[PDB]
Structure 1
Amino acid sequence: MAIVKATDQSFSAETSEGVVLADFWAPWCGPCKMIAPVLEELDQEMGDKLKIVKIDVDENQETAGKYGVMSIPTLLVLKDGEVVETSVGFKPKEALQELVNKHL
């Protein structure tokens, strides 16, 4: 499964492996639950080239602060361990595929 669970301790190691799309969220979130099945569709559609890295902002304020994340769901596209793009809020799988594609 392409989807992984990380913290500030592991985030950089996980995001080093190619294009990775991190999901700054928290289980207390509402809108994040809408995009979760879209990330499962992304496992099913991009998991050959993509990794998806969920990170719980309620325990990872430092990593959130690293990019000024102040709302969720927030999406950080990293490539080879550094941020390459950002997006905020819900997006459909096609728009997310394009957001990945522009850095593949």
Structure 2
Amino acid sequence: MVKQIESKTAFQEALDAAGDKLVVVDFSATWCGPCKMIKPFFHSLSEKYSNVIFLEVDVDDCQDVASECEVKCMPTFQFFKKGQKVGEFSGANKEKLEATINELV
């Protein structure tokens, strides 16, 4: 299911507890239309792939996590494995979200 991140401490903790699993982070903003458009599909991916951790970071609540991860477009999806960023793209592209998850898992 999708884990809502509300601090830098909760982000770090989640990337530590994921262990060996792929972590997909959706960086979004409430004002951004493409972000609202892809939110149901992002939550469907979390029920389909139980072996992948799905995080949501609202850039307005976690401005510090947003700056440190160098987010500049909404939505941006960053992919992490064992604390290292292994992929990233921006845009509400459903096919490419799922396709990148199947390459990295």
Common topology (TM > 0.5) = yes
2-structure distance, mates of 1:50, 1:78: 10
Matched residue, 1:36: 39
Is 2:14 the counterpart of 1:14?
Answer: yes
Match of residue 65 from structure 1: 67
Provide the residue aligned with 2:89 in structure 1.
87
Counterparts of 2:62 and 2:99, CA distance in 1: 27
Q: Distance in 2 between matches of 1:60 and 1:40?
A: 20
**TM superposition score normalised by structure 1:** 0.85
Shift of 1:87: 1.0
The unaligned stretches of length 5 or more in structure 2 are none
> CA RMSD of the aligned region, Å?
1.5
Q: CA deviation at 1:4?
A: 0.5
The C-alpha deviation readout for 1:32-81, integer Å capped at 9, x for no partner, is 011101112202321x1111100011122222222321221111111122
Total equivalences in the alignment:
101
- Scaled by the length of structure 2, the TM-score of the pair is 0.84
Structure 1 regions of 5+ residues with no counterpart? none
Q: For the residues of structure 1 that align with 2:73 and 2:97, how far apart are their CA atoms?
A: 18
Instruction: Indicate the SS of the match to 1:23.
Output: strand
Please state whether the residue corresponding to 2:97 is helix, strand or coil: helix
- Partners of 2:93 and 2:11 in 1: CA distance: 23
Percent identical residues:
30
Which aligned runs of 4 or more in structure 1 are off by greater than 6 angstroms? none
